[PDB]
Amino acid sequence: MVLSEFEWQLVLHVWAKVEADVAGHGQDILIRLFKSHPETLEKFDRFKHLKTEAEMKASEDLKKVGVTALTALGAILKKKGHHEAELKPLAQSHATKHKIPIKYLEFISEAIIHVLHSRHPGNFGACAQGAMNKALELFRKDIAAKYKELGY
């Protein structure tokens, strides 16, 4: 699949808004992921003992991990699909080191959309949501291709 230039424009304008508060978006995304899908927290050896939303909000480690993920995602999105070099190492680490199934990447994609809608009323309508859904789908499909090459 491919996104149109117009779809990329929508994605990257949204992402530039995310960049005004990367840490806050990252915290909200991971907390939404862990509350909606608690099994995902087990994959985080650095902070899998966290239990409550208040503990998660007080964790500097959770915040830093969220910032790193959003930073990498932003760098990849800015390649507008031409992201082979940037995405390959990430796909490899998630297959082999972190052991993240595709279903968990679907869960985090849902969390991203949810948080974008929650944090950006009036600036995240149907056009932007559809474009971001497609960009995240492309990201997941390209990761899945690398997973298949590894037999994961």
Binding site for ligand HEM (CB under 6 A): 40, 43-44, 46, 65, 68-69, 72-73, 90, 93-94, 98, 100, 104-105, 108
Would you say 78 or 122 has its CB closer to ligand HEM? 78
Give the separation between CA 99 and CA 114, rounded to whole angstroms.
Answer: 24
Q: How far is the CB of 43 from ligand HEM (least distance, A)?
A: 4
Render 77-102 in DSSP notation, one character per residue: HTTTT--HHHHHHHHHHHHHTS---H
Q: How far is the CB of 2 from ligand HEM (least distance, A)?
A: 20
- What SS3 class is residue 58? helix
Enter the DSSP assignment of 47.
T
Helix 22-36 / helix 102-119 crossing angle, nearest 10 deg = 130
Q: How far is the CB of 30 from ligand HEM (least distance, A)?
A: 9
Distances (CA, A) of 92 to 86, 89, 148, 152: 11, 5, 11, 10
Q: How far is the CB of 113 from ligand HEM (least distance, A)?
A: 11
Nearest CA to 75 out of 83, 63, 64, 67 is that of 83
Q: How far is the CB of 142 from ligand HEM (least distance, A)?
A: 12
- What SS3 class is residue 129? helix
Would you say 67 or 120 has its CB closer to ligand HEM? 67
Would you say 110 or 122 has its CB closer to ligand HEM? 110
Would you say 44 or 152 has its CB closer to ligand HEM? 44
Would you say 85 or 122 has its CB closer to ligand HEM? 85
